[PDB]
Design a protein around this ligand. Structure first.
Ligand SMILES: CCCCCCCCCCCCCCCCCC(=O)OC[C@H](COP(=O)([O-])OCC(O)COP(=O)([O-])OC[C@@H](COC(=O)CCCCCCCCCCCCCCCCC)OC(=O)CCCCCCCCCCCCCCCCC)OC(=O)CCCCCCCCCCCCCCCCC
Ligand SMILES: CCCCCCCCCCCCCCCCCC(=O)OC[C@H](COP(=O)([O-])OCC(O)COP(=O)([O-])OC[C@@H](COC(=O)CCCCCCCCCCCCCCCCC)OC(=O)CCCCCCCCCCCCCCCCC)OC(=O)CCCCCCCCCCCCCCCCC
Ligand SMILES: CCCCCCCCCCCCCCCCC[C@@H](O)O[C@H](CO[C@H](O)CCCCCCCCCCCCCCC)COP(=O)(O)OCC[N+](C)(C)C
Ligand SMILES: CCCCCCCCCCCCCCCCC[C@@H](O)O[C@H](CO[C@H](O)CCCCCCCCCCCCCCC)COP(=O)(O)OCC[N+](C)(C)C
Ligand SMILES: CCCCCCCC/C=C/CCCCCCCC(=O)OC[C@H](COP(=O)(O)OCCN)OC(=O)CCCCCCC/C=C/CCCCCCCC
Ligand SMILES: CCCCCCCC/C=C\CCCCCCCC(=O)OC[C@H](COP(=O)(O)OCCN)OC(=O)CCCCCCC/C=C\CCCCCCCC
Ligand SMILES: Nc1ncnc2c1ncn2[C@@H]1O[C@H](COP(=O)(O)OP(=O)(O)O)[C@@H](O)[C@H]1O
Lengths: 107, 459, 54, 320, 347, 48, 42, 98, 140
């Protein structure tokens, strides 16, 4: 059996490289310390400073396009009027029956 | 809507014309800026929708999904920056290009005034994910996982195209607005039954349903961290969005039709939560937890009540964020250990305390601890199911308990106990990983202050 | 985990499809290259079409 | 106007360039024989073009700059290691043999291209013909396996079935003890380690197979060391003989057109030297292949096409 | 051969096709088919070897039988109506025999057996010509007499072609046989819409011809005829492998790639005529074509196969001959979905 | 530590004459690398 | 190999592009004018 | 439709079937093709003469010419096939398989 | 041709069990003979006697499958007193499938036959009821 016991010419599997050994304060971003530090800074500034803070403030102070206070005021004025008239609050029928034309059965 | 689409398209020339060592910095910054731009869409009305043009519209069901899709890209870039270090510039640029194309396809998918355009983009999202899974994958089974992921999807979705073209031939329009205003009842007929099945199964396979959930563990385990993130966070929600959009035409046929699916999901959540208890893999455990959550979302959509829809939307958003965080944590462990098995590396709280805190918060938010939005969706869906039937609660009860169990199990196996004596290459956690976890977790605890922002159009 | 998820759910949809497609491909593609058999099949299908579609 | 079907259609006919002096000739000698000296004098006297024997980096001399590239980027083998350890574990022996055969094939293609495009004849050392004698000796000495010679035979058949044999083959015959003595007198420490059995197998191989097979389709001039010193008699023998038994008299204009299109486009010439048969001595893994290809790409003038390399000094790139 | 002779033969093939396309008399159509048959044979035998001779004689036998059946159909049509103009067929099974002759000419099932053999025997350029240009004339005749065809027989042979192509492509390691089975399946897709809309047939023909041209030119550029021979291309031309993988995905019918446009339209058209089951079955069967395309993509560019040592020398040389239309073909076969409505141009 | 890439054994599966070898097709051989196969003057006696 | 920018091919390419653009502009102007005249706009 | 035309079409069908049988001898394949063209010529000539289509008298000759040219091509091919094997047996062409 | 189709379809579903069984057996025999002819043309196994034995085996298997299909479906439809119900065709279809499995002697192939023939029979019944068209005419 003169076979070399090697299936093919292969590079050895390289060992993992540590970013901390060649550079303390390595931030886990890049092997180049300058690009490292600037990438850390831009990620922190454009994520925590800009998006999470300004965006949260913007979402918090969004105008009432859902019309919740509008609906509350409409209901307040409506109930104020109905109680005075003696009307029984909200009607059972969503549409007035006089303008609905039922089909006569005659069965 | 083009104010979001055009910057996403411009992300590609910017990446390809970038300096060889400035791609990550440029991509993250501009992705975060595009995410900020996406925030404008959140200010919805109680009226119809935000109809920008004939091609794209916005909705308070579409807006949270769009915001999450935009927010996911910087996180995916930061997660992928680590293991692509020994890689040529061209292939890193190709990876970033694939991520950008995936975001663009998802953004166009979520607006999609027309159903055929929605289907085209819904299936266009398939190619970048397949290439990411089968190219930058570590194990030899990534090819089989890619084949499973492709063919399950296409087998589910090919009848959907025929159903859609038939529906347009009969009705005359595939536009969402026209369909909603001109919806007419479907008679209980065999042809209508098969049309319902063709309309539903394509979105059912991607949730995925308990019967059809096999592709997901393979795809999640074999994909890189960015692939796992995008699969768990956004790609699973496409089925739920499609069901919520297409179910309007289906009634009144859904009530009779829904039983096989309701039973499959109510038993499959228990089955998958129980499977999570006996697992030797982090990624598989997270995948099965995702399957359980999406089975609950399927139940919510099939019940088809307002509370069901709000709970489904909230649960989809919360699960996306939580599962992305969990996969990121598992990948941080794997990049140090290179084994991706829970029982090997133990007692990591002693060595990495802050990362253990992140693990605790992620496991708590997966456990649906109040007042997190996870439990908001959980409780809305549970209440809707109880109104649907007072017996469902029992199953739901089991699910909750089982969920908590495996969550804390995953917290106890890897963080508590005694550290393995032999492993010595556990270096201190980097600033990048801690920033990744913080950016994953802070939006959840911010959203729990304003739940209505993610409760959908039926709020 | 093992009985249903790893075995039977796998047996039903994916494995059955793989086996059926493999068998069909093997049957169809296994032709020895003899135009004798090809043209005998051609005669058979010609006569069948003459007898069936009119 | 690069040579193609259009040139052949319009004016380009290579039959008119032949002036009975082309006469492709290959000279073969045993190790340490002065085959090169005889061939150079033949080329000078007959007015032909001499081709130095193809080495490890022969292909490097024709692409880009003539300076040879790194051993790992070109050949991935060395003759010195073969002499030191002919039974090396990494299979350098058959890798050396295969690379040398491929270089000889490229050299033969270049010589044929020059002969067809100019009409001036060429003189060659060991060509793709008679290159198998080293294979046979290496097999008999146990340096290589039987799978290696099977792969060599496959590649040699597929490649050499497409070319015209040399008009005249010239052999210089020298005794084994004499060539060993020349080996010590040479002074090369690596060459000192050649065993007498290896030379005897190689010397024996030329006589047993090469002469008989080429005598039926070529013209052979067996010469000894003394009578090979004077090239006047050699050139006289070359001129007196007339070739009418080989395939060359049967060729015509269209066959020459096909052969000239064949010898050009060296990529298709070397097409079958990389056939997908996996022998451990020559197969290379994906990671090593990727890394070595990237290193070759990072060479100064190899990233782009020859005329599109900015760092070398090519100008007007944006308008070519 | 002599380049002048090759140019003359190519022009004769094209002139026969044009004579078929422009003539209104059945005899002139048959004469054009004869001219194309006569001029095609030497093209298949440019590289002389027993394989090419066997492929050429098989092709000649099949095409001569098809021509004889075509003439018999023409003569029966003349017998039952003294007409030579190419119009409605005017008769029973005379039309059946006409359809069988045109199906054998096109290579549709059950007359598909000769396509893989002839494609494997001949070289890549001859295969390109055979699989691209040799479909124009029979499809033109079928489009002309489409209102005559019995839908049952045409649809049966189309479904058979799709099924046989899908199943037969799964078992192949040779690239030329893969292309032949792809051609069979694509012709099956083409002829299933002839009874309903010939414009869709022509659109499918254009898209398929573009994709096949791109694929064959990519295969010629990286001169490989086997899966493993193609697996060595990444070590020299990775961009070629990437373009090839994109083209293969396009040929699989994946959106948003160009190859999705025909099937989509065809399915759409078939739904207008109250037909659902056949479009469904056609899509589910084209899934098999996608599977073997995806296997080829796995072996081509998504994974890096082992290489050989001599490959290093190939790193030092560049292709002398460059194909000018290859870049355009790739773009047209990849990125023309948004221009879909342009099919109203009656292409 | 390194992404998996196909080895020689993986590559060999696609080198057969056909995919999915069977007992009947086991004896089939791949076509030659170039599509050429091995190819594998009378006498007259004018007597009186 | 060792080649200069072929000014013949460059000139032909630029001339073809400019001619095509000019012809396209002229065709568009004529089409607009002809459409206006046919529909009686101006 | 008289019986003579039916007999001619039956003859053509018999020739086509015999071509499709392939016992051996590809020369017999060419013979079957030539019998088919002969039947085509005969029946086309009978139909044209009967209806007095004067200008159609061109067509049979044309057909004959073209068909005979085809035969020549086929014969050439046969020779080369034989020139490889020495015999024109059909089963010798088993190199190409589906 | 379509003569067998007309013979089978003309008989009412809930009556004349023997006539339905005979029509189904004839259709099965024709299908088996066609399949046998295809197999013989594509693959000559060894000889004339083996070929005719193979044709007989295939034809009788298909005829038995069709006979069991017809008898079981018709009997189920008659006893259930609910005609035009695809469930009867499901039951009869995989009674035929189970008979096929018994003939081939494999439990797995028997269960697969029940699944994939009951579903097919139910689909054919649904198509007959709802008017689905396998080969639709060109409407427009
Ligand atoms: C309670 C009121 C608070 C008011 C003050 C504001 C507090 C803001 C805190 C924001 C959360 C922290 C950020 C999240 C990740 C951690 C950040 C970090 O890196 O810390 C490092 C930092 C320094 O660490 P170190 O010493 O370097 O590292 C040591 C090791 O890592 C070892 O680390 P460790 O073991 O020390 O771990 C840290 C510590 C804490 O760290 C965490 O676990 C953070 C996550 C805790 C919650 C987990 C999710 C559960 C869902 C809750 C959703 C609430 C959303 C409310 C809005 C939030 C807006 C952002 O562990 C815990 O204490 C576990 C707490 C479990 C709480 C269970 C009950 C939850 C519901 C309580 C009611 C909330 C609403 C009340 C409404 C009704 C009354 C008003 O430690 C801390 O900052 C600890 C923070 C104090 C604990 C807060 C726990 C309650 C927070 C609830 C959310 C805010 C409620 C606001 C209204 C309250 C009324
Ligand atoms: C739309 C439908 C499209 C249908 C499919 C397209 C058909 C493609 C076949 C075209 C002819 C063969 C060819 O061009 O090779 C494919 C070609 C690759 O060429 P190649 O493999 O490098 O050439 C090797 C030749 O086989 C080796 O041939 P060679 O170097 O011996 O040939 C000498 C050359 C040089 O010609 C001359 O020297 C001219 C001599 C004049 C003689 C005048 C005789 C008059 C009688 O003549 C030709 O190449 C053929 C010229 C025929 C002109 C017909 C007009 O790529 C394409 O043709 C793709 C074109 C895109 C489709 C068609 C154009 C777009 C629409
Ligand atoms: C480290 C230890 C602690 C130190 C710090 C101590 C201080 C603790 C205080 C922090 C929280 C404690 C609770 C105090 C809450 C007060 C603020 C609160 O009231 O404001 C909320 C406002 O918060 C926002 O509503 C929610 C935040 C928005 C979330 C959007 C996410 C940010 C975008 C990033 C990308 C998205 C990724 C996920 C995609 C969906 C609710 O406002 P609301 O009652 O309504 O009305 C406001 C007044 N109006 C009527 C004029 C409008
Ligand atoms: C594998 C992992 C999960 C995959 C997804 C599974 C979910 C899809 C399953 C589909 C659910 C049921 C389909 C049809 C339900 C119709 C209701 C029926 O079951 O009830 C009776 C129907 O009776 C019988 O069920 C008849 C059908 C019997 C044939 C069906 C096959 C049964 C088992 C097959 C399951 C295999 C599914 C997967 C195939 C690959 C009612 O009697 P009837 O009043 O008359 O019919 C009412 C309907 N009408 C009005 C249109 C006429
Ligand atoms: C696992 C998914 C669930 C599968 C459940 C059933 C599986 C068994 C079915 C196998 C495929 C059957 C193909 C033939 C079905 C025929 C149905 C049909 O034709 O109805 C079409 C119907 C009416 O036909 P017309 O003739 O036009 O109406 C006029 C008279 N009323 O029109 C339509 O609705 C067209 C819609 C296409 C139907 C979809 C066909 C495919 C089956 C439905 C999808 C279910 C399988 C999904 C696969 C899941 C994999 C993830
Ligand atoms: C009508 C016909 C419908 C046909 C539908 C086809 C569905 C698509 C799957 C096609 C796979 C068939 C081919 C096949 O599987 O080959 C066996 C192959 C062997 O691998 P090879 O790389 O080819 O080589 C092995 C030896 N070295 O096995 C596999 O690897 C399979 C791995 C991926 C499995 C994919 C599962 C896809 C099916 C999921 C369910 C949906 C199927 C589609 C119809 C569903 C019905 C509604
Ligand atoms: N086919 C071959 N195999 C191995 N070595 C070879 C082969 N051909 C040539 N060589 C090497 O080429 C070297 C130079 O050749 P040689 O004629 O002996 O010396 P010189 O160039 O001075 O005339 C020799 O040392 C010989 O080993």
């Amino acid at each position: 059996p003169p076979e070399p016991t090697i299936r093919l010419q292969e590079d050895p599997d390289p060992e993992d490289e540590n970013l901390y050994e060649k550079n303390p304060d390595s931030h886990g971003y890049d092997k180049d310390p300058i690009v490292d530090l600037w990438n850390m800074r831009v990620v922190f500034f454009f994520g925590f400073s800009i998006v999470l803070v300004l965006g949260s403030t913007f979402v918090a102070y969004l105008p009432d396009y859902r019309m919740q206070e509008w609906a509350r005021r409409e209901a307040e004025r409506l109930v104020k009027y109905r109680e005075a008239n003696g009307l029984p609050l909200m009607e059972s029928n969503c549409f007035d029956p006089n303008k609905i034309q039922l089909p006569e059965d005659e069965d | 809507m083009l104010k979001i689409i055009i910057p996403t398209t411009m992300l590609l020339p910017m990446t390809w014309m970038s300096k060889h060592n400035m791609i990550w910095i440029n991509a993250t910054v501009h992705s975060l800026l595009i995410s900020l731009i996406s925030l404008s869409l959140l200010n919805q009305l109680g009226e119809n929708s935000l109809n920008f043009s004939l091609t794209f519209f916005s909705d308070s069901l579409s807006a949270p999904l769009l915001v999450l899709t935009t927010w996911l890209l910087p996180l995916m870039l930061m997660a992928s920056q680590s293991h692509l270090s020994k890689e040529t510039t061209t292939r890193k640029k190709l990876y970033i290009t694939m991520l950008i194309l995936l975001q663009l396809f998802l953004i166009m998918t979520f607006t999609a005034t027309e159903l055929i355009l929605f289907y085209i983009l819904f299936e266009a999202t398939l190619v970048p994910t397949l290439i990411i899974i089968t190219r930058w994958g570590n194990q030899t089974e990534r090819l089989n996982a890619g084949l499973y992921f492709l063919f399950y999807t296409l087998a589910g979705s090919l009848p959907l195209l025929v159903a859609l073209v038939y529906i347009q031939n009969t009705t005359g329009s595939l536009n969402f607005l026209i369909i909603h205003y001109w919806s007419h009842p479907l008679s209980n007929s065999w042809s209508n039954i098969f049309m319902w099945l063709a309309c539903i199964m394509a979105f059912m396979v991607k949730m995925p349903l308990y019967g059809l959930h096999l592709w997901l563990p393979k795809a999640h385990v074999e994909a890189p961290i960015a692939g796992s993130m995008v699969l768990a966070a956004v790609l699973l929600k496409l089925g739920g969005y499609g069901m919520m959009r297409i179910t309007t035409i289906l009634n009144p046929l859904t009530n009779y039709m829904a039983y096989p699916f309701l039973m499959l999901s109510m038993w499959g959540m228990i089955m998958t939560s129980s499977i999570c208890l006996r697992q030797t893999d982090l990624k598989s455990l997270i995948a099965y937890s995702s399957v359980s959550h999406m089975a609950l979302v399927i139940v919510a959509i099939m019940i088809q009540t307002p509370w069901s829809f709000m709970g489904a939307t909230a649960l989809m958003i919360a699960h996306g964020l939580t599962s992305s965080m969990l996969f990121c944590l598992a990948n941080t462990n794997y990049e140090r250990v290179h084994s991706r098995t829970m029982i090997l590396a133990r007692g990591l709280q002693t060595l990495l305390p802050l990362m253990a805190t992140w693990w605790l918060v992620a496991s708590l938010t997966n456990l649906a601890l109040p007042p997190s939005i996870n439990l908001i969706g959980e409780l809305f869906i549970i209440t809707a199911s109880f109104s649907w039937s007072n017996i469902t609660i029992i199953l739901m009860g089991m699910n909750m308990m089982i969920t908590a169990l495996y969550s804390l199990y995953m917290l106890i196996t890897t963080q508590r106990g005694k550290y393995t004596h032999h492993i010595n290459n556990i270096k201190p956690s980097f600033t990048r990983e801690n920033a990744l976890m913080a950016l994953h977790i802070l939006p959840l605890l911010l959203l729990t202050l304003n739940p209505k922002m993610i409760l959908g159009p039926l709020y | 985990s093992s009985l249903l998820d790893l075995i039977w759910l796998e047996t039903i949809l994916p494995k059955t499809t793989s086996f059926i497609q493999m068998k069909m491909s093997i049957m169809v593609s296994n032709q020895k290259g003899l135009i004798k058999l090809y043209f005998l099949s051609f005669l058979i299908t010609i006569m069948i079409s003459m007898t069936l579609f009119n | 106007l690069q040579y193609g079907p259009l040139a052949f259609v319009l004016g380009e006919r290579t039959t008119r360039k032949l002036t009975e002096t082309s006469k492709v000739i290959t000279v073969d000698g045993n190790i340490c024989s002065g085959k090169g000296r005889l061939a150079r004098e033949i080329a000078e006297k007959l007015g032909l073009r001499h081709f130095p024997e193809a080495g490890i980096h022969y292909a490097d001399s024709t692409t880009g700059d003539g300076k040879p590239l790194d051993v790992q980027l070109s050949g991935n083998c060395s003759l010195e290691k073969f002499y030191d350890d002919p039974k090396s574990n990494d299979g350098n022996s058959y890798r050396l043999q295969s690379w040398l055969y491929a270089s000889r094939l490229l050299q033969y293609a270049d010589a044929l291209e020059h002969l067809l495009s100019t009409g001036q004849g060429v003189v060659l050392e060991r060509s793709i013909y008679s290159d198998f004698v080293f294979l046979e000796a290496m097999y008999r000495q146990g340096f290589i396996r039987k799978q290696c010679v099977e792969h060599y035979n496959e590649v040699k058949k597929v490649t050499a079935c497409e070319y015209l044999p040399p008009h005249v083959v010239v052999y210089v015959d020298v005794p084994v003890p004499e060539i060993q003595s020349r080996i010590q007198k040479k002074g090369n420490p690596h060459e000192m380690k050649i065993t007498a059995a290896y030379l005897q197998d190689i010397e024996n191989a030329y006589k047993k197979t090469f002469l008989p097979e080429m005598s039926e389709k070529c013209e052979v001039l067996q010469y000894s060391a003394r009578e090979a010193e004077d090239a006047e008699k050699v050139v006289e023998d070359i001129e007196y003989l007339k070739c009418d038994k080989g395939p060359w008299p049967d060729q015509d204009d269209r066959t020459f057109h096909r052969l000239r299109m064949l010898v050009q486009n060296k990529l298709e010439v070397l097409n079958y030297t990389t056939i997908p048969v996996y022998l451990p001595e020559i197969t290379i893994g994906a990671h090593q292949s990727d890394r070595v290809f990237q290193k070759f790409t990072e060479l100064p003038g190899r990233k782009y096409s020859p005329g599109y390399n900015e760092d070398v000094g090519d100008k007007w790139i944006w308008l070519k | 051969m002599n380049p002048i002779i090759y140019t003359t033969l190519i022009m004769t093939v094209m002139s026969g096709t044009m004579l078929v396309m422009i003539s209104s008399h059945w005899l002139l159509i048959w004469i054009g088919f004869e001219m194309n048959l006569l001029a095609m044979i030497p093209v298949l035998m440019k590289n002389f070897n027993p394989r090419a001779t066997e492929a050429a004689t098989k092709y000649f036998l099949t095409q001569a039988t098809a021509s004889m059946m075509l003439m018999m159909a023409i003569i029966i049509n003349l017998l039952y109506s003294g007409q030579w103009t190419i119009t409605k067929m005017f008769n029973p099974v005379a039309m059946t025999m006409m359809t069988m002759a045109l199906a054998m000419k096109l290579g549709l099932s059950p007359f598909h057996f000769w396509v893989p053999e002839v494609t494997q025997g001949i070289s890549l350029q001859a295969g390109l010509l055979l699989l691209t240009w040799q479909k124009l004339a029979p499809l033109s005749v079928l489009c002309q007499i489409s209102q005559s065809i019995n839908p049952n027989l045409m649809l049966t042979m189309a479904m058979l072609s799709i099924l046989i192509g899908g199943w037969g492509g799964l078992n192949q390691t040779q690239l030329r046989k893969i292309m032949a089975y792809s051609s069979i399946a694509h012709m099956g897709w083409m002829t299933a819409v002839l009874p309903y809309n010939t414009t869709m047939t022509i659109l499918n023909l254009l898209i398929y011809i573009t994709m096949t041209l791109a694929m064959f030119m990519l295969l010629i550029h990286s001169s490989a005829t086997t899966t493993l021979s193609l697996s060595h291309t990444w070590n020299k031309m990775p961009v070629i492998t990437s373009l090839m993988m994109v083209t293969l995905l396009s040929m699989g019918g994946l959106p948003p790639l160009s190859g999705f446009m025909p099937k989509w339209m065809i399915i759409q058209e078939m739904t207008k005529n109250e037909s659902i089951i056949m479009p469904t079955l056609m899509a589910m069967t084209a899934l098999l074509n996608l599977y073997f395309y995806m296997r080829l993509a796995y072996s081509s560019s998504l994974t890096m196969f082992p290489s050989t040592n001599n490959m290093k020398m190939k790193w030092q040389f560049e292709h002398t001959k460059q194909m000018k239309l290859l870049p355009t073909m790739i773009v047209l076969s990849t990125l023309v979905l948004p221009m879909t409505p342009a099919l109203s141009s009656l292409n | 530590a390194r992404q998996w890439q196909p080895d020689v054994e993986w590559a060999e599966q696609f080198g057969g004459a056909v995919m999915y070898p069977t007992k009947e097709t086991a004896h089939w051989k791949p076509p030659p690398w170039n599509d050429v196969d091995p190819p594998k003057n009378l006498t007259l006696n004018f007597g009186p | 190999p060792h080649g200069s920018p072929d000014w013949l091919k460059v000139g032909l390419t630029l001339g073809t592009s400019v001619f095509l653009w000019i012809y396209l502009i002229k065709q568009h102007k004529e089409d607009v004018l002809e459409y206006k005249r046919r529909n009686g706009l101006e | 439709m008289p019986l003579v035309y039916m007999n001619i079409i039956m003859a053509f069908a018999i020739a086509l079937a015999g071509l499709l049988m392939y016992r051996s001898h590809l020369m017999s394949s060419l013979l079957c093709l030539e019998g088919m063209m002969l039947s085509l010529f005969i029946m086309s000539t009978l139909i044209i003469l009967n209806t007095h289509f004067t200008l159609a008298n061109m067509m049979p000759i044309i057909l004959l010419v073209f068909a005979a040219c085809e035969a020549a091509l086929g014969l050439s091919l046969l020779v080369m096939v034989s020139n490889t094997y020495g015999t024109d047996y059909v089963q010798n062409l088993n190199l190409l398989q589906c | 041709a379509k003569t067998l189709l007309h013979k089978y379809s003309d008989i009412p579903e809930g009556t004349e069990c023997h006539r339905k069984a005979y029509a189904s057996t004839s259709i099965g025999g024709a299908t088996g003979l066609i399949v046998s002819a295809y197999s013989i043309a594509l693959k000559p196994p060894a000889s004339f006697l083996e070929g005719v034995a193979r044709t007989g085996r295939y034809t009788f298997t298909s005829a038995a499958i069709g006979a069991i299909f017809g008898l079981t479906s018709c009997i189920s439809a008659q006893v259930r007193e609910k005609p035009d119900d695809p469930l009867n065709y499901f039951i009869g279809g995989c009674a035929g499938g189970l008979t096929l499995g018994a003939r081939t002697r494999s439990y797995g192939i028997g269960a697969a036959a029940c699944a994939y023939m009951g579903l097919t029979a139910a689909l054919v019944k649904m198509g007959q009821l709802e008017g689905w068209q396998v080969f639709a005419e060109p409407k427009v």
